[PDB]
Design a protein around this ligand. Structure first.
Ligand code: AGS
Ligand code: MG
Ligand code: ZN
Ligand code: ZN
Lengths: 111, 105, 396, 121, 124
């Protein structure tokens, strides 16, 4: 189970670290108090007002899936607990755990 | 929507906390001497002047505050932009906006 | 000759004679809309039959005696011919005082006790002192103890040596039974039905249904469910004072999930308020009070004191007061203090059978001692030296 | 193992490291060899983090933040872990089987190493 | 320019090789290749056999009081508990035993070649 935050960015504020982030759906709007790691993640991936993004809360994995004013803004709750199911082959486990950055061998041979 | 400054939020929090110390919410059914603040101001009680009442007030907790929904009490990931109140669901947000956001109804 | 023991609490007065038992009587006057011109005093609340919409006239604001007229009337009723028939000129009185009591209140207490009643001798102590004395009488091998007094209007934590109170380490929490009851009233009014005028009924509800959770978030998850798996949720039938004299909880087998009942009972459904209200004692910041809870305050008070004494303090934590009667209070306190206490130091928390009357028992014990006469202040000495020597002798 | 309540290097260079670890069964104060301070700084260990320290090797692993601090921000990319249940000091007597080939391959190539050649290797 | 491939896997997969310290032995007692370039033949053969600590010396140093301060250069019990002190002295004894065992373990292995031999055999 993972917590996924998907919404439209309203306002992003970062000050010298503390920051605030305001996200909205078609049904609710919220302001978040950001931590250092999420602030760094949002700085690394340029995020501006109007972008529709999804955030993996535990990892900070932010992927921009378009802009809205093109993808329609999400409708329901901003923060959703989702059940993610992965089917991983034994070869995949072996290659991932064979060495550091070993997952690259799943794509380029080099096992 | 409108936005409330820090002073308004602090005043609301202080008013709610003081209201929690009220003896009764209604008025006297008969309908026809000091208070604590008067006693404090008369005592002229100064900080660091030995063990006294004020120095005994507990300090801030180390563990961070845990947010709870202002409507139903369950944990609340969201903070209302307008007033800073916490909430957990679209239904709870609607109830908060109708009831206690902005004007205190 | 005889000695009177009184715990002039903000909610209940534990008044009795040293040679007799203890009585619990509300220390406040009452007015009701069922009486046009009639103010009830002290235990007269038993006479009223419709305590709904009851109005409370309290002599304590924020746990200190601030209203003198109502307190005087209550004392006159308690000391009058109806209750105890106290012979003032030949009786010693042991009366409790709030911690860090203001000088003006002490002056007024001494003046009233020594002039308006003319008691033979007065001994003013704190309830925690009597509780400590009782604990040390019970446990003679222990040299130190720490007393937690979670009462109606506040929650103090006071460490006591064998015969002295460490005033430097006293910690007060501004969370008490009054605050919890008002918070429960506000929650119920905001969520289900308006009960802000039903302080008595909501207080009884808190006393009957609330409990302290060992796992806060597990209980929150359980309460959030719907159906049979929501074991936390219960149904309470408020007393209408017509056919239901006192409130009660519906049995689980008789519970209806839909919430609609053919009987026209006004049913109040509490799921997360069961443990949210008692949790304010351990986490004041839950409602907005930036103060440390009971366990953190205990540990901080003990760690302020010298290192050599610390293991003795951690081994003798004593819980007194009404708020300590919540289910799971002792286990939660022990768990949190053990979590914060250094591992080499053993932690022992003791909950007496009657935390309400612990101070009264301590006062009875201190009255029976042979050193009692040295502690009290007489009226003959009051005439000349009293106003200084009351401050000098009493360790308030 | 436990949540870090205090991390104080003692200056004479660093003579020793005083650390405070918290568990459900109490708190323990430990004096650390100064070489472990480099490991603590590399792992980015701060107060409130749940770590374990190997007594024989000084290895430090920061296995997340304590869940008591989960509400310190509304959105941080952190992994919050429950406070450990047992004592701070945990002893276990174990019997592990290894083969000679394991030792051969363990000694075939170097491990760790802050040099440029080791890193490129 | 294309975005990279985001390969998503189960969080449990990244912990497959991880073994808890209480479940694994110390593999540093068989580390021969780690001693090369760091440990010398002198340390293994002449110094350590002579200047290894003993339990007696360790206990004597631990129990003895602090040494007197180094001279400056010159140009020429009511609260006492028996159980707590017994626990503390048991902890001190355990700590000293651990120090001894770790000091013995960390210098038991001798290099296959050693720094001196490698330096001698290494031409410019
Ligand atoms: N079974 C119970 N469970 C929970 N709370 C209870 C219970 N019985 C009594 N109380 C509470 O106990 C409080 C009164 O306790 P007391 O300590 O006797 O008050 P008091 O000492 O007279 O006033 P203070 O605090 O000393 S000034 C009230 O707030 C009650 O709600
Ligand atoms: Mg009391
Ligand atoms: Zn809600
Ligand atoms: Zn709002």
């Amino acid at each position: 189970e993972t917590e996924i935050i998907e919404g439209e960015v309203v306002e992003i504020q970062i000050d010298r670290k503390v920051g605030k982030l305001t996200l909205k759906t078609t049904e609710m709007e919220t302001i978040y108090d950001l931590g250092t790691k999420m602030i760094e993640s949002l700085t690394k991936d340029k995020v501006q007002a109007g972008d529709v993004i999804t955030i993996d809360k535990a990892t900070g994995k932010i992927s921009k899936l378009g802009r809205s004013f093109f993808v329609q803004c999400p409708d329901g709750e901003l923060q959703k607990r989702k059940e993610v199911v992965h089917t991983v082959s034994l070869h995949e486990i072996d290659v991932i755990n064979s060495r550091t950055q070993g997952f690259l061998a799943l794509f380029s041979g080099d096992t | 929507r409108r936005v409330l400054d820090r002073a308004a939020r602090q005043r609301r929090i202080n008013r709610q906390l003081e209201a929690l110390e009220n003896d009764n919410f209604q008025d006297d059914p008969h309908a026809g001497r000091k208070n604590f603040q008067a006693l404090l101001e008369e005592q002229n009680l100064s900080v660091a002047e030995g063990p006294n009442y004020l120095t005994a007030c507990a300090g801030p907790p180390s563990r961070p505050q845990r947010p709870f929904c202002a409507v139903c009490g369950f944990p609340s990931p969201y903070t209302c932009v307008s007033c800073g109140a916490r909430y957990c669901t679209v239904r709870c947000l609607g109830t908060h906006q109708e009831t206690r956001c902005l004007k205190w109804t | 000759m005889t000695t009177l023991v009184l715990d002039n609490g903000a909610y209940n007065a534990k008044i009795g004679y040293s040679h007799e038992n203890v009585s619990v009587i509300p220390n406040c006057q009452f007015r009701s809309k069922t009486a046009r011109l009639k103010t009830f005093t002290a235990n007269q609340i038993d006479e009223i039959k419709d305590p709904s919409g009851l109005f409370y006239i309290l002599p304590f604001q924020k746990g200190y005696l601030v209203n003198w007229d109502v307190q005087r009337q209550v004392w006159d009723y308690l000391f009058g011919k109806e209750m105890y028939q106290v012979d003032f000129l030949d009786t010693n009185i042991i009366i409790t005082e709030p911690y860090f009591n203001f000088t003006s209140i002490q002056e007024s207490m001494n003046e009233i006790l020594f002039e308006e009643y003319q008691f033979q001798a007065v001994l003013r102590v704190n309830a925690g002192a009597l509780s400590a004395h009782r604990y040390f009488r019970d446990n003679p091998s222990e040299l130190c103890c720490i007393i937690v007094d979670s009462g109606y209007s506040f929650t103090h934590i006071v460490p006591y040596c064998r015969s002295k109170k460490k005033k430097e380490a006293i910690i007060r929490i501004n969370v008490g039974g009054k605050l919890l009851t008002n918070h429960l009233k506000e929650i119920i009014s905001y969520r289900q039905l308006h009960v802000m005028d039903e302080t008595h009924v909501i207080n009884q509800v808190k006393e009957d249904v609330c409990y302290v959770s060992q796992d806060f978030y597990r209980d929150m998850d359980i309460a959030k469910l719907k159906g049979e798996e929501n074991t936390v949720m219960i149904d309470y039938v408020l007393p209408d004072f017509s056919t239901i004299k006192k409130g009660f909880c519906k049995p689980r087998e008789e519970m209806v999930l839909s919430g609609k009942y053919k009987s026209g009972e006004q049913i109040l459904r509490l799921a997360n308020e069961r443990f949210a209200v008692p949790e304010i004692l351990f986490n004041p910041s839950d409602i907005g009070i930036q103060e440390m809870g009971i366990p953190e305050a205990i540990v901080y008070s003990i760690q302020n004191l010298p290192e050599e004494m610390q293991p003795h303090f951690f081994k003798n934590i004593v819980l007194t007061g009404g708020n300590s009667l919540f289910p799971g209070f002792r286990d939660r306190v022990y768990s949190e203090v053990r979590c914060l206490t250094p591992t080499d130091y053993d932690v022992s928390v003791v909950l007496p059978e009657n935390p309400i009357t612990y101070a009264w028992e301590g006062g009875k014990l201190i009255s029976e001692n042979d050193d009692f006469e040295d502690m009290v202040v007489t009226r003959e000495d009051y005439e000349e030296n009293g106003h200084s020597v009351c401050e000098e002798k009493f360790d308030i | 193992e436990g949540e870090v309540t205090e991390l104080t290097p003692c200056e004479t260079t660093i003579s020793h490291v005083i650390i405070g670890l918290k568990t459900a069964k109490g708190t323990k104060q430990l004096k650390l060899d100064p070489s472990i301070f480099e490991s603590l700084q590399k792992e980015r260990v701060e107060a409130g983090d749940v770590i374990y320290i190997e007594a024989n090797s000084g290895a430090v692993k920061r296995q997340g933040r304590c869940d008591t601090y989960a509400t310190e921000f509304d959105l941080e990319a952190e992994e919050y872990v429950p406070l450990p249940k047992g004592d701070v000091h945990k002893k276990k007597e174990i019997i592990q089987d290894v083969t000679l080939h394991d030792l051969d391959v363990a000694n075939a190539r170097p491990q760790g190493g802050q040099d440029i050649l080791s890193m490129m290797g | 320019i294309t975005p990279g491939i985001c390969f998503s896997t189960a969080s449990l997969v990244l912990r497959a090789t991880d073994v808890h310290p209480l479940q694994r032995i110390d593999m540093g007692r068989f580390d021969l290749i780690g001693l090369e370039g760091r440990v010398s033949r002198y340390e293994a053969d002449t110094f350590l056999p002579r200047h290894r600590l003993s339990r007696r010396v360790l206990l004597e140093v631990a129990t003895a009081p602090d040494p007197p301060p180094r001279p400056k250069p010159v140009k020429m019990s009511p609260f006492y508990l028996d159980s707590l002190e017994e626990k503390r002295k048991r902890q001190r004894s355990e700590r000293l035993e651990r120090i001894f065992q770790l000091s013995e373990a960390h210098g038991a292995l001798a290099p296959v070649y050693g720094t001196e031999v490698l330096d001698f055999c290494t031409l410019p």
